[PDB]
Design a protein around this ligand. Structure first.
Ligand SMILES: [Mg+2]
Ligand SMILES: [Mg+2]
Ligand SMILES: [Mg+2]
Ligand SMILES: [Mg+2]
Ligand SMILES: [Mg+2]
Ligand SMILES: [Mg+2]
Ligand SMILES: [Mg+2]
Ligand SMILES: [Mg+2]
Ligand SMILES: [Mg+2]
Ligand SMILES: [Mg+2]
Ligand SMILES: [Mg+2]
Ligand SMILES: [Mg+2]
Ligand SMILES: [Mg+2]
Ligand SMILES: [Mg+2]
Ligand SMILES: [Mg+2]
Ligand SMILES: [Mg+2]
Ligand SMILES: [Mg+2]
Ligand SMILES: [Mg+2]
Ligand SMILES: [Mg+2]
Ligand SMILES: [Mg+2]
Ligand SMILES: [Mg+2]
Ligand SMILES: [Mg+2]
Ligand SMILES: [Mg+2]
Ligand SMILES: [Mg+2]
Ligand SMILES: [Mg+2]
Ligand SMILES: [Mg+2]
Ligand SMILES: [Mg+2]
Ligand SMILES: [Mg+2]
Ligand SMILES: [Mg+2]
Ligand SMILES: [Mg+2]
Ligand SMILES: [Mg+2]
Ligand SMILES: [Mg+2]
Lengths: 357, 206
RNA sequence: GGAGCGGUAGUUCAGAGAAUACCUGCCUGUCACGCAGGGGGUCGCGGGUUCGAGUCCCGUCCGUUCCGCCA
RNA sequence: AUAGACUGA
RNA sequence: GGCCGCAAGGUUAAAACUCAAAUGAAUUGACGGGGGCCCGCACAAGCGGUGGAGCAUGUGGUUUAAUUCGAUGCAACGCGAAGAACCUUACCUGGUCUUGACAUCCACGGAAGUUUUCAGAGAUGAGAAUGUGCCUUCGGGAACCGUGAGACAGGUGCUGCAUGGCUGUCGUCAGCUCGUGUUGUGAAAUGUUGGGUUAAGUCCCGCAACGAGCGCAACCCUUAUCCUUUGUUGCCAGCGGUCCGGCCGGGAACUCAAAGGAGACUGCCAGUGAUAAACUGGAGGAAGGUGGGGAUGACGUCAAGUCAUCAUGGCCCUUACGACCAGGGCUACACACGUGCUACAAUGGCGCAUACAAAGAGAAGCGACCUCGCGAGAGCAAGCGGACCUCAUAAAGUGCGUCGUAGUCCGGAUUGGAGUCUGCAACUCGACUCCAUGAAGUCGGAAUCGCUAGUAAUCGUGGAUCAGAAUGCCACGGUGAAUACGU
RNA sequence: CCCGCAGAAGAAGCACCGGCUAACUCCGUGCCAGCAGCCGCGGUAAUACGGAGGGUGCAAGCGUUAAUCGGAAUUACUGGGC
């Protein structure tokens, strides 16, 4: 079976060679070496050092795959000298070398799935029923159950944040926190509307009906603003209290106005008779406004990603689940699985792997 | 709903058995299996011989097979060569000496098995189901049957939805136990599926 | 800034309870309603008195009020 | 005397 | 916009845009918290249960490497499964094979086979001996094993919303139709409606209808009475004798056994009724109005169930979605539901004594008698392919004694120890026996089920599956009620 | 316009085939791509989508769009209704 393991790693190396196109990376390296070999590259140090690091990045994949095939040949040769000569010592040594090759190959395998700052952040799944009514709610409940079971299989923690139970059956909307290593990276590609094609149990006539449920996965964010304002970035000016005392002959410089020098936001307080209390109130208001600015920065996605969220209805399907004919298919990846049962409870990684492309 | 088999419900009243032999519990199963093998062989070879039914009788250490057919000439063969060859194989299957006799089923139109086989053959040859059913009913009534009911079920005409059609003329009393109701079934393997044909023939009471 | 009122079941209110809420089992073709059986907080947070504290006392967050004026 | 509602192939 | 009006508003009066319909009369169904008339344990009157406890079993859920697949209101849930330790097995882990485990066919080598070692958990692999046979144009081969093809095998893989076949259900409900004639432009109507009457579209009468078919009834099985046969392995009235035991001699009476007939037909009498159909009674008769029970399930309804009995179009895999083997799983367990068994005791527990059944199975089987073991059973060994022998003491019941209202001399769950039987092998995961322990449970909330007479309730007995493994399924008898004013 | 020379030699495409309306099968797709004057077709066995074979109707033209009349007795004078 160890020879089968060698072939399996050979298959993994060969497909990883195709995916990462190390020959094309070497093709990129062809013109990388053109300017690096000649001394006429330090005129612009950005051209020199960046190419040097890019060359290392290209050769990282290229050389590892080269060492991968060479190592596989060495393991095959050692096992031929081991099993045929009954040398169990070399038989175990080649297994350890083969395991080391798998570790090197897995590094490049994980390299492709490495993407985004939130790649290791905990993911938050939101499932909302759409067209289909009660049947859509049931489909949403079936959708969240397999997501929870998939997360449990991966070992990720499950936390039901909120669920608004359906009026008749199922749940209208669920929000579940899935916490684990690279949880967002695993489930970031499960975003969209899923189509369910089955005979509706709620329909009296038993007609074949189509239902839709959404699945929005938003990553873990700081969700907190701890920005502290700077006295050097703030300008405070005192002036007469125009309100409630601006009429009298005797006016004091109790009114204050704090203007943020970088941003330009102006804040003024005239309620209290003491300039120090007015300064404190203006400081609270200005800091609160700055807090709002960072919140609006976070809210930029709440107006963009929410708009990008396609309607839960016809024509927005990302994956088709034909339970009547047992032909679950992901249109985006072109992957068809005949076993509906498995996809209904777990085994979603089969479509996830192709979705990582 | 569901209907009892006319032959089974009339087995002891107005119908004979297709297998008449006495055996204890030890050899009852062996005799039944041997009869099944003999019938399977004879039906396969004499499919083109228009065999209505086969009766297997087991005397002491012997098996006498009577084959009822509408075309005795082909079954008998030249100088009895065909029946002799059939007798040899039947004896080999049974394990005891065999004696094959041939009976003539005159008026082939008044036989449930023959009509059902003819209809299925026409359906396989893509003959219109209604034309086949009407012709079979008309022939039986012309010959002198007091009543005939023909039912054809399946994907008739290649339609994606199967349906059941039936034509009945005369009296076909299925609730009278003293009625000589001849009932038989057959199946036609068309290019779209399997089509079942059932024939009821009433030839009088008692 | 001064003087009071509070903070208790998921929520609203009493002093560890009530209503709503939530489970489970019934009824019904199914839901709702309805019937029956249950659980659910250890008193905003800390300290101190007390044999003994949700309670009494002090400090602190938290919300509610009124006042904060005359030149 | 009380008694409501059955999405969408 | 104009005119009118105190106002509310009235009068005249568009356009953009949108859809392929909107609408009237009539027809067939379906429905109504519309009407009239009826039926069914449907209510009403009763009896006994479930829902509370323990256990058995199935299901959902959860868990798991797998916990195989299917069945989901009535009409899924002691269901396919009339019986998972291996097998079954279709699932998982691991070790293996790849014209294959299973088929045809070509060529070549071989008889086929029968025994012994051999390494492996086993598959398998390496050997070693033994025979090397039979029909035989003695020319052949025939059969049965291997090798090498490659056309092909193989699938419990998907679709029951492509199908055949089979089945459930409304529902054994009484309805569903057709030919011709007639009416209406037509969908359609009539017949098939109406007065009775019936279990019934059962029958009579009327009628633009006349007839017919599938349905109802009858013909079929069984039971209740009698006659005729036949009298053994069954029976014992008259006897003969007898150990008193139908035990022999006997007998063909009777019970009984299985074949053929008789009998029940509103056939007869009274009364009502439209001089009809029928109904209410009565006589006789074993049986009176279908005497009881069963089989028999119309056109169709649910795209109802089954592609996993089987067959089957199409699609899918072919060094694997095929095949072999070992082990494990289907028996997992924070829970919920369904169907049952045992109880919560005195109409009873226990000890002793003593009566009354029916039906069925048995040859790789039923197993007598005797001996041994407290017991499950063990040894020996008759009879029976059976009205003969065995399974095979029926229990409830009756008599006596005791317990004396207590979680008990109720209840027997659970657990410890020791054994028997089948089976290669009872760890996961069989049944049973002996000693020991002795749980909940003291009659069960909302709610819910079955039953109209030899029925309910209760008591035992047998069979299919099956080497072993029933509280389930199927059948057999023993005691044996209460109630039905009525719609 | 006529007479000679040479050689079949230099010369056929467009729309459509579910019904209206003449002309049918296979393959690919799977409520997607798309078609569409109206009814509508496509959700794994499509004569309606795309391609191929065959066929139909026109032809140096063939289809689509725009505009008028007709069908429209659907402004009814011929010739309608409350
Ligand atoms: Mg509403
Ligand atoms: Mg106006
Ligand atoms: Mg009642
Ligand atoms: Mg219970
Ligand atoms: Mg199951
Ligand atoms: Mg299946
Ligand atoms: Mg097993
Ligand atoms: Mg096994
Ligand atoms: Mg079906
Ligand atoms: Mg007419
Ligand atoms: Mg009628
Ligand atoms: Mg009728
Ligand atoms: Mg009438
Ligand atoms: Mg009739
Ligand atoms: Mg009449
Ligand atoms: Mg009488
Ligand atoms: Mg009948
Ligand atoms: Mg179905
Ligand atoms: Mg199904
Ligand atoms: Mg099971
Ligand atoms: Mg067990
Ligand atoms: Mg017997
Ligand atoms: Mg006891
Ligand atoms: Mg107790
Ligand atoms: Mg009754
Ligand atoms: Mg038995
Ligand atoms: Mg058994
Ligand atoms: Mg009984
Ligand atoms: Mg045409
Ligand atoms: Mg196609
Ligand atoms: Mg005009
Ligand atoms: Mg008009």
């Amino acid at each position: 079976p160890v020879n089968n393991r060698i072939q399996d790693l050979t298959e993994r190396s060969d497909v990883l060679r195709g995916y990462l196109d190390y020959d094309a990376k070497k093709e990129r390296l062809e013109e990388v070496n053109a300017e690096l070999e000649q001394p006429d590259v330090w005129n612009e140090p950005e051209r020199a050092q960046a190419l040097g690091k890019e060359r290392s990045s290209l050769e990282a994949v290229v050389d590892t795959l080269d060492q991968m095939k060479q190592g596989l040949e060495d393991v095959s040769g050692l096992l031929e000298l081991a099993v045929e000569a009954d040398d169990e010592e070399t038989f175990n040594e080649a297994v350890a070398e083969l395991d080391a090759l798998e570790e090197k190959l897995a590094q490049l395998e994980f390299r492709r799935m490495f993407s985004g700052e939130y790649d290791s952040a905990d993911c938050y799944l939101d499932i909302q029923a759409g067209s289909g009514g009660t049947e859509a709610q049931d489909w949403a409940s079936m959708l969240e159950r397999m997501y929870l079971r998939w997360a449990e299989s991966r070992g990720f923690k499950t936390e039901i944040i909120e669920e608004s139970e359906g009026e008749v059956a199922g749940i209208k909307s669920v929000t579940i926190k899935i916490s684990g290593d690279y949880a967002y990276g695993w489930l970031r590609t499960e975003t969209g509307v899923h189509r369910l094609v089955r005979k509706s149990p709620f329909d009296s006539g038993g007609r074949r009906h189509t239902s839709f449920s959404s699945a929005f996965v938003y990553p873990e964010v700081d969700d907190d603003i701890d920005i502290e304002i700077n006295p050097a970035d703030l300008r405070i000016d005192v002036y007469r209290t125009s309100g409630a005392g601006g009429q009298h002959v005797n006016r004091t410089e109790s009114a204050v106005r704090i203007t943020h020098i970088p941003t330009g936001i102006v804040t003024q307080c005239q309620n209290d008779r003491s300039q120090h209390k007015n300064k404190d109130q203006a400081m609270k208001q200005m800091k609160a406004k700055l807090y709002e600015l960072e919140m609006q920065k976070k809210n930029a996605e709440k107006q963009a990603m929410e708009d990008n969220k396609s309607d839960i209805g016809w024509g927005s399907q990302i994956r088709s689940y034909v339970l009547d004919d047992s032909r679950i298919k992901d249109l985006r990846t072109g992957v068809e699985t005949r076993n509906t049962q498995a996809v209904l409870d777990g085994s979603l990684d089969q479509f996830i792997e192709a979705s990582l492309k | 709903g569901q209907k009892v088999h006319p032959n089974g419900i009339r087995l002891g009243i107005v119908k004979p058995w297709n297998s008449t032999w006495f055996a204890n519990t030890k050899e009852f199963a062996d005799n039944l299996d041997s009869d099944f093998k003999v019938r399977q062989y004879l039906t396969k070879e004499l499919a083109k011989a228009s065999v209505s039914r086969i009766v297997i009788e087991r005397p002491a250490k012997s098996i006498r097979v009577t084959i009822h057919t509408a075309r005795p000439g082909i079954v008998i063969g030249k100088k009895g060569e065909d029946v002799e060859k059939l007798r040899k194989v039947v004896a080999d299957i049974a394990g005891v000496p065999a004696q094959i006799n041939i009976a003539e089923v005159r008026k082939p139109e008044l036989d449930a098995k023959l009509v059902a086989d003819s209809i299925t053959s026409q359906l396989e040859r893509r003959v219109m189901f209604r034309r086949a059913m009407k012709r079979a009913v008309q022939n039986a009534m012309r010959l002198g049957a007091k009543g005939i009911k023909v039912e054809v079920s399946g994907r008739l005409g290649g339609a994606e939805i199967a349906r059941t059609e039936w034509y009945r003329e005369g009296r076909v009393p299925l609730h009278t136990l003293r009625a000589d109701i001849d009932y038989n079934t057959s199946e036609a393997h068309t290019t779209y599926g399997v089509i079942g044909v059932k024939v009821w023939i009433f030839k009088g009471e008692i």
